[PDB]
Structures are given as C-alpha cells and as structure tokens.
Amino acid sequence: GGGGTNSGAGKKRFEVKKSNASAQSAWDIVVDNCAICRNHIMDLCIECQANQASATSEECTVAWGVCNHAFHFHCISRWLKTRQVCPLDNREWEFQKYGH
C-alpha cells in the first residue's frame, strides 16, 4: 500500500462573493401557515381578511393533512378542486381532520 500527498496551504486564491444571479435558493416550506394563500395557520386567508370573513376570523377554515400537512380548508379545497396532490408533497392529498 501507500499514502496520499501532503495537503499544502498557501495555494489559496482570494475568493470573491461572485454570483451571476441573486436568487441562490428559495425558502423552506412551512405547515404553520397556509402555503396556498401564504397566510398564517388556522387564521384568515388571502382575500378573506380584507373580505371580512363571516364565520370565524380567528380561523377562516383549516384542515390537516394525513401527510403531515396543514393548510386552510378553504385554500386546500380550491387546490383539490383543480389538483389531486399536495402543493408541497406532490403526493395525493388526504384529509386528516377538517370538521366542517
């Protein structure tokens, strides 16, 4: 057998914060808010806060997903109306608990 070469320092070139585009990455997905409207969990939705929801303003509508997801029931219902899969998981959405 044998060994490798000895890593020598001093061959360092000065690095520059240099990127073609400022969009290095996106932001992580959160279930403590409704990603669909991008409003806080179990609270008022997009328009709904401006709209003046007439039921509960504490919570417009919320539903939990078996897939460890949390969205607004309103938002997820519209989503499901057009899509069969989670906006985040890209897996078929399943209702854990929604209530009404």
Q: Is 70 in the site for Zn ion (CB under 5 A)?
A: no
Sign of CA dihedral 29, 81, 53, 49: positive
**Is 40 known to sit in a ligand binding site?**
no
In which residue are the tokens 């219902």 written?
Answer: 77
SS3 97: strand
Q: Is 72 in the site for Zn ion (CB under 5 A)?
A: yes
Q: Is 67 in the site for Zn ion (CB under 5 A)?
A: yes
CA distance 55 to 65: 22
Interface stretch with Zn ion, choices 2-10, 11-19, 21-29, 30-38 (CB under 5 A) = 30-38
Helix, strand and coil content of the chain, in percent to the nearest 5, comes to 15, 15, 70
Interface stretch with Zn ion, choices 3-11, 12-20, 22-30, 66-74 (CB under 5 A) = 66-74
Q: Which residues lie near Zn ion (CB under 5 A)?
A: 34, 36-37, 45, 48, 60, 65, 67, 69, 72, 74-75, 86, 89
